Design a binder for these strands. Sequence first.
RNA 1: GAUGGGGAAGCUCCGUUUCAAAGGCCUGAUUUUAUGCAGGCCACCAUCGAAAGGGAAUCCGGUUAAGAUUCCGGAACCUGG
RNA 2: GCUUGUGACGGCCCGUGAAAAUCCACAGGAAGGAAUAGUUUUCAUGCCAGGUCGUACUGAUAACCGCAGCAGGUCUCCAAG
RNA 3: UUGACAUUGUGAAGAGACAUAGUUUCUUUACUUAUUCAAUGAAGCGGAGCUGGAAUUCAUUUUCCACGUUCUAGCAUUCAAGGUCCCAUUCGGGGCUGAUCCGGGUU
Lengths: 252, 121, 233, 52
Amino acid sequence: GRVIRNQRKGAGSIFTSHTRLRQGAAKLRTLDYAERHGYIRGIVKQIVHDSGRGAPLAKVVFRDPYKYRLREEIFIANEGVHTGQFIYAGKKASLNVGNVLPLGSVPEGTIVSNVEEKPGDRGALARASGNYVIIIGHNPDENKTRVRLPSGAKKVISSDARGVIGVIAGGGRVDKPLLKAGRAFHKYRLKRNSWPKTRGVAMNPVDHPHGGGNHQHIGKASTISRGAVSGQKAGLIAARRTGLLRGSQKTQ
Amino acid sequence: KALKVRTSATFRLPKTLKLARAPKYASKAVPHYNRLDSYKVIEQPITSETAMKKVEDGNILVFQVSMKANKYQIKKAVKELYEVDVLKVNTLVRPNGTKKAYVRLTADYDALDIANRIGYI
Amino acid sequence: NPLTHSTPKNFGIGQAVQPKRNLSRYVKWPEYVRVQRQKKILSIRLKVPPTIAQFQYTLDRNTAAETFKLFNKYRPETAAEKKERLTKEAAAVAEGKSKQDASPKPYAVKYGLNHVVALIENKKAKLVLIANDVDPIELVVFLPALCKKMGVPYAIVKGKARLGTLVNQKTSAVAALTEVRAEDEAALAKLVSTIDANFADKYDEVKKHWGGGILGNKAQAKMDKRAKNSDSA
Amino acid sequence: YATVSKTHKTVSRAYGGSRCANCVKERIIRAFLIEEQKIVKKVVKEQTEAAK
RNA sequence: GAUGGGGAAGCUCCGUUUCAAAGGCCUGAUUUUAUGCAGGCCACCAUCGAAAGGGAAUCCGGUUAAGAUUCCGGAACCUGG
RNA sequence: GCUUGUGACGGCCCGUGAAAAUCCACAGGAAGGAAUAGUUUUCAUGCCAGGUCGUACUGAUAACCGCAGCAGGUCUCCAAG
RNA sequence: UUGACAUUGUGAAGAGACAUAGUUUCUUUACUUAUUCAAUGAAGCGGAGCUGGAAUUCAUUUUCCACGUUCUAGCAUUCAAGGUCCCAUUCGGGGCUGAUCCGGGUU
Ligand SMILES: [Mg+2]
Ligand SMILES: [Mg+2]
Ligand SMILES: [Mg+2]
Ligand SMILES: [Mg+2]
Ligand SMILES: [Mg+2]
Ligand SMILES: [Mg+2]
Ligand SMILES: [Mg+2]
Ligand SMILES: [Mg+2]
Ligand SMILES: [Mg+2]
Ligand SMILES: [Mg+2]
Ligand SMILES: [Mg+2]
Ligand SMILES: [Mg+2]
Ligand SMILES: [Mg+2]
Ligand SMILES: [Mg+2]
Ligand SMILES: [Mg+2]
Ligand SMILES: [Mg+2]
Ligand SMILES: [Mg+2]
Ligand SMILES: [Mg+2]
Ligand SMILES: [Mg+2]
Ligand SMILES: [Mg+2]
Ligand SMILES: [Mg+2]
Ligand SMILES: [Mg+2]
Ligand SMILES: [Mg+2]
Ligand SMILES: [Mg+2]
Ligand SMILES: [Mg+2]
Ligand SMILES: [Mg+2]
Ligand SMILES: [Mg+2]
Ligand SMILES: [Mg+2]
Ligand SMILES: [Mg+2]
Ligand SMILES: [Mg+2]
Ligand SMILES: [Mg+2]
Ligand SMILES: [Mg+2]
Ligand SMILES: [Mg+2]
Ligand SMILES: [Mg+2]
Ligand SMILES: [Mg+2]
Ligand SMILES: [Mg+2]
């Protein structure tokens, strides 16, 4: 039969992301000489809304150590950071909300945002509004540092990998009901064409594993193996258990 | 001894000598004569009766003119082929793909006077 | 002193645009430059096998300088000099009736690879010089092995170009003497002796020694320092 | 603006056509005070350097 | 959508500033003489894509069978030199 | 009053509502410039030039698309009592 | 998706046979030049040294860290001022130093 919806997305045609309005990628500074020996000062010149992003960005200008010129970077704004505020970035810099320090240089239980997976990658972990990571240990002979990411997973990465002190702002966003279809409508309007969603069980067979039959029903287990093949993976993919979750979740 | 001293880490293409063309033979054997002399610019008078009026009333000569010619080339060509001085030159493409030049002479010339010393009427 | 003033700039992170410095160590060289450097590195990180490793041991600046000194007295004819000789003999041979021997026996250096090889096989060289470049090394790698067998004293010498000079070609790859004027037999036997001592004699032992396996120095330091302290507490 | 005399594109004072007066009061006060504290800061840690 | 490139038997596919030696400006040096060099910057990498988006500057009167913010008249304004 | 324009405000947003050409300004102070005479064309006045293509008319119960002078379809501005 | 072979090289300990000399095979953990991934207008890498100074000296230094920027929504550019050496002192202009050495491995 046909090619199912979830296969059509990969060609990206009507499914690429609606982007005209976005401020620009958000990154930490390039890990230059200043930032890995000393520290370098900047001013947040503005904190600003990004289209289809939860948390506001923070525009921070720095002096170019090598040319006479201002070089402005785009951060995700940690809560509490503000216009005018002075931001410090470097190994030898000071442990305050807003600054950017290498996970090696902050004590355990420090709380940081927008952290790198490898040093230099200008920030990958914990960027969504409200999220952060916690340093939960160090191993100095190897300079790994151990973090717990928003998911619960605990990675270990270079103590050189940089992070920014605090949590990312606009948290709480998801506690309030969308209420009507219009509000989701405009929500995905500035993200990507993923809304609304036809249930495959409302489709015909050509369309989808779940399509067809004289009452709507999946007809077979909707738990699909990892070893499945495109055109087949719809449902609960690789599901290692299923059903209503009872009792405290929380990874140990 | 020892090394250069580049203060830039960008390496660029060395600005190197550019020789000019000194052919072993002539490009095309004989250059083309002028492809748009005045006898090719201005092709005929236009002697439509509503044209003949601009002449009588407006001190203006209407010519069918080369499609390849511009206001410059039209103005010079009139000036040369007729003694006449030109004030300005309006032009337009007729609907049979040919160009019409409305040529205003300066106040010193009587275009009507010209018109019959060129022939038409 | 006067209305002039000391104002030292402070170039110390987060202040004063850094000054112009020499970034030569940093520049983003062209691929072709990057590549010929890295080829030289690669050939030295690897363990190079003995029959190539026998090159790199190149004749020393001294002994060599005096080997070109003898050899440069044996250049081949020039165009003028061969024009010159012909008339001198087109003249005499045709009328004075010289047996095509209105010309003195030429003594010059012997060159051209395939030429030099057959000379050696046929036991006529007395001193082969092999050049230490030559990029398809194969053209030449067997030349030591070959000269050892023909009991022909040889020397790997720096300058594939400089062997070209002594024979009026841009490069030359090999250069050999076979004949020599009595007034030079001596000079040669001296050279042949020194040279035989830095190569032909050392041959079998050179043959057992691989080369390369040589760290870059960011890695060497990582090893002198690591293997200083780890043992010496 | 390129068809208009320069007086239409400035007020006199430093940073005339470009910053808002009240804001230059600020640049000036702060410049002064911060250049001055820079003196206060040296001689304080200049003295430190021989009393430790 | 060309380009150094990378795929592909190939028609061609991918990439667009991309693991590329990617260029041109202000004048000085010229007073054999016309433009070679002498500083220095700038490293931005094509181009096409809007007759509703951005955008230098014109109006009133009069005039034709049929043109008019376009012609005639008067009165302006922009751009380059 | 009506249409339209515009201003200072106020409501809404898990929506906060393009780009680039182009223009000007300021920080800077390389450099240039006077009394036996310099500096000034961002003040006034003055001189020269401004190419190429489109420009009629219909825009609809007959000028477009529906085999057609088809009761269909086809984007918009002005709007009296 | 899983195995094998090829790309595939260098140490080291450990298991495996001629049947308790080391050619060879694998397990392991080292290496970095192949291959791979990021980064930047390939800018400050590795090594040594000046100085500071904790240290306690078991002869004298064995070391280990340091080794220009944090009240402020300013300012930081003309190979840098200073100092020092040149040209034949013009007006301009150049070296060094300021800014320590060494290796050219961009990280
Ligand atoms: Mg199908
Ligand atoms: Mg996209
Ligand atoms: Mg949709
Ligand atoms: Mg649904
Ligand atoms: Mg659903
Ligand atoms: Mg149905
Ligand atoms: Mg099916
Ligand atoms: Mg099924
Ligand atoms: Mg079904
Ligand atoms: Mg159901
Ligand atoms: Mg008249
Ligand atoms: Mg026209
Ligand atoms: Mg001779
Ligand atoms: Mg004013
Ligand atoms: Mg001023
Ligand atoms: Mg293409
Ligand atoms: Mg265009
Ligand atoms: Mg347009
Ligand atoms: Mg437009
Ligand atoms: Mg009218
Ligand atoms: Mg008319
Ligand atoms: Mg009309
Ligand atoms: Mg007019
Ligand atoms: Mg007038
Ligand atoms: Mg003008
Ligand atoms: Mg309206
Ligand atoms: Mg708003
Ligand atoms: Mg302005
Ligand atoms: Mg100068
Ligand atoms: Mg003017
Ligand atoms: Mg019309
Ligand atoms: Mg009609
Ligand atoms: Mg038809
Ligand atoms: Mg109809
Ligand atoms: Mg395996
Ligand atoms: Mg780099």
